[PDB]
């Protein structure tokens, strides 16, 4: 949404740009606050080098996941 | 003015809540287009309310009746042209020249007069 001057109807000389408004945050329930601490691991591909098919980084990630035993892995 | 969707225990709907004065005046007196009108019992205003040369007051709508058996009068025609310039500083469209042609007797019910203008003026 712009606020400007358009006297000829063929071009807008903008003067103000309205800032956008984000969505409201998720409203917690009483049950949601009763949960305990958790850990989430996050990783993204590719899981192999540009010249190999052995998928060694995938095995390394599996070893790390086993070692750290997180609550969730994405 | 009552609401458009007014409802009650005894009446189901109401018609004419938001109607306008001009429509009722036009249709009640059966005025169909510009024509001669008769107005009776004129009243004189305390002060002028218009730039017109003559003024009058009608107390009630039923005091004005339509008479159709009279010829129409010629009007005054005014044409004008304007020139504008955008402001160099900012976004303004200033006026620098006007030029107008006027004809004091233009007949609606006859052919266009030749020439269609009598006098004129200019300003710069």
From Swiss-Prot, chain A:
Superkingdom, natural source: Eukaryota
Subcellular location: Nucleus
Post-translational modification: Phosphorylated in a cell cycle-dependent manner, in G2/M phase.
Domain characteristics, as noted in the entry: The N-terminal 240 amino acids are sufficient to mediate complex formation.
Similarity remark: Belongs to the DNA polymerase alpha subunit B family.
Subunit organization: Component of the alpha DNA polymerase complex (also known as the alpha DNA polymerase-primase complex) consisting of four subunits: the catalytic subunit POLA1, the regulatory subunit POLA2, and primase complex subunits PRIM1 and PRIM2 respectively. Within the complex, POLA1 directly interacts with PRIM2/p58.
Role noted for this protein: Accessory subunit of the DNA polymerase alpha complex (also known as the alpha DNA polymerase-primase complex) which plays an essential role in the initiation of DNA synthesis. During the S phase of the cell cycle, the DNA polymerase alpha complex (composed of a catalytic subunit POLA1, an accessory subunit POLA2 and two primase subunits, the catalytic subunit PRIM1 and the regulatory subunit PRIM2) is recruited to DNA at the replicative forks via direct interactions with MCM10 and WDHD1.
The name this protein goes by in its record: DNA polymerase alpha subunit B
Lineage: Eukaryota, Metazoa, Chordata, Craniata, Vertebrata
Positions spanned in the full protein: 303 to 376 of 598
Swiss-Prot record, chain B:
Clinical note on disease: Pigmentary disorder, reticulate, with systemic manifestations, X-linked: An X-linked recessive disorder characterized by recurrent infections and sterile inflammation in various organs. Diffuse skin hyperpigmentation with a distinctive reticulate pattern is universally evident by early childhood. This is later followed in many patients by hypohidrosis, corneal inflammation and scarring, enterocolitis that resembles inflammatory bowel disease, and recurrent urethral strictures. Melanin and amyloid deposition is present in the dermis. Van Esch-O'Driscoll syndrome: An X-linked recessive syndrome characterized by different degrees of intellectual disability, moderate to severe short stature, microcephaly, hypogonadism, and variable congenital malformations.
Family recorded in the similarity comment: Belongs to the DNA polymerase type-B family.
Leftover remarks: In eukaryotes there are five DNA polymerases: alpha, beta, gamma, delta, and epsilon which are responsible for different reactions of DNA synthesis.
Cellular localisation: Nucleus; Cytoplasm, Cytosol
Residues spanning the membrane: none
Designated gene of the protein: POLA1
Note on domains (UniProt): The CysA-type zinc finger is required for PCNA-binding.
Subunit annotation: Component of the alpha DNA polymerase complex (also known as the alpha DNA polymerase-primase complex) consisting of four subunits: the catalytic subunit POLA1, the regulatory subunit POLA2, and the primase complex subunits PRIM1 and PRIM2 respectively. Interacts with PARP1; this interaction functions as part of the control of replication fork progression. Interacts with MCM10 and WDHD1; these interactions recruit the polymerase alpha complex to the pre-replicative complex bound to DNA. (Microbial infection) Interacts with SV40 Large T antigen; this interaction allows viral DNA replication.
Function of the protein: Catalytic subunit of the DNA polymerase alpha complex (also known as the alpha DNA polymerase-primase complex) which plays an essential role in the initiation of DNA synthesis. During the S phase of the cell cycle, the DNA polymerase alpha complex (composed of a catalytic subunit POLA1, a regulatory subunit POLA2 and two primase subunits PRIM1 and PRIM2) is recruited to DNA at the replicative forks via direct interactions with MCM10 and WDHD1. The primase subunit of the polymerase alpha complex initiates DNA synthesis by oligomerising short RNA primers on both leading and lagging strands.
Section of the entire sequence shown: 463 to 586 of 1462
Cystine bridges: none
Name of the protein described by the UniProt record: DNA polymerase alpha catalytic subunit
């Amino acid at each position: 949404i712009m606020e400007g001057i358009n006297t000829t109807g063929r071009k807008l000389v903008a003067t103000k740009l309205y800032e956008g408004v984000p969505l409201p945050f998720y409203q917690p329930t009483e049950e949601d606050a009763d949960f305990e601490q958790s850990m989430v691991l996050v990783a993204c591909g590719p899981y192999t080098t540009s010249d190999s098919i052995t998928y060694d980084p995938l095995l390394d990630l599996i070893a790390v996941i086993n070692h750290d035993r997180p609550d969730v892995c994405i | 003015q009552l609401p458009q969707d007014l409802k009650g225990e005894t009446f189901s709907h109401v018609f004419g809540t938001n109607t306008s004065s001009l429509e009722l005046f036009l249709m009640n007196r059966k005025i169909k287009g510009p024509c001669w009108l008769e107005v009776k019992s004129p009243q004189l205003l305390n002060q002028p309310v218009s730039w017109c040369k003559a003024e009058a007051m009608a107390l009630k709508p039923d005091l004005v009746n339509v008479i159709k058996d009279v010829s129409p009068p010629p009007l005054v025609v005014m044409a004008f042209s304007m020139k504008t310039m955008q402001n160099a500083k900012n976004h303004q469209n200033e006026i620098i020249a006007m030029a107008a042609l006027v004809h004091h007797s233009f007949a609606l019910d006859k052919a266009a007069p030749k020439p269609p203008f009598q006098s004129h003026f200019c300003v710069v």
